Amino acid sequence: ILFTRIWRLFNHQEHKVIIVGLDNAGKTTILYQFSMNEVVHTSPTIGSNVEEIVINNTRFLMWDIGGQESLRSYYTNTEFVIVVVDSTDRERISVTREELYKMLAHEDLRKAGLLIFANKQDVKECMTVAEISQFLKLTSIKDHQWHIQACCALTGEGLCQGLEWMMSR
Template structure:
């Protein structure tokens, strides 16, 4: 980033740009959540399974996010790692009602955390325990236990219970992410 951009950022004239990777199994609600975070004029009504990935943008009070919304389908998950180098934050979405595949979500998370481009990076990870509206959804505490999140010692992380359809719980998570990225002082 050039000096002018830094100055503009400090003066609040220009929002700092952050690259975020949105990961998680297919059908967990990634695209639904990212769509909800966009301004209402840019939101779409038709959410379809993502093919490969799509690039989305949204802004908070001080940051401008570029999100790589990756497909969670098995055949596309090998694409994730190609974006790890440029990711400055991760949003990892879990379908809290998908008890059967919680173990698969954990496997994908473990593979992510042990990847050479991630393992030594102090990258913040925001977990969305999504689909809380469903009757058989596990609590965010239970999801956190099943994914063994307490074992993540070298990266800041946070988990929020969310309902992607209504947009509930998302703001708290994004506020945490913004606070964390600002504290990182990456200017």
């Protein structure tokens, strides 16, 4: 009920939201927790791998980064960029790092707030939130409002606190 009330309230206005990460990060699982007892509409786009998910006033644009996406490079009007990171995939974490900086470099995202969800934190020996932040060098980003939040999309633990950081903006 507490995550709900803040969501319902967060949606007093329409928000444009990007949610990115590597395949299997937990992006879809997260938009599902967001979708409980809500009205959902999903739609592919033209000329891109982007899926548009509308959950009651919030327009999420989502896609995977990495692979053939790396070999490509909208942002405009997006209030929030959500990067979902799989806390256990140390191997490909650097791929997310390179993409994250290529996005923030575009002037269209000048005003977008940055939310990192360190997901799959229920898994043992996963990377800490402190290691994710310093690996992604989040303190070096001075032209953007940012927050990192540990979460577990399966149960939705942490997702209300990332939403509070967003609503607070």
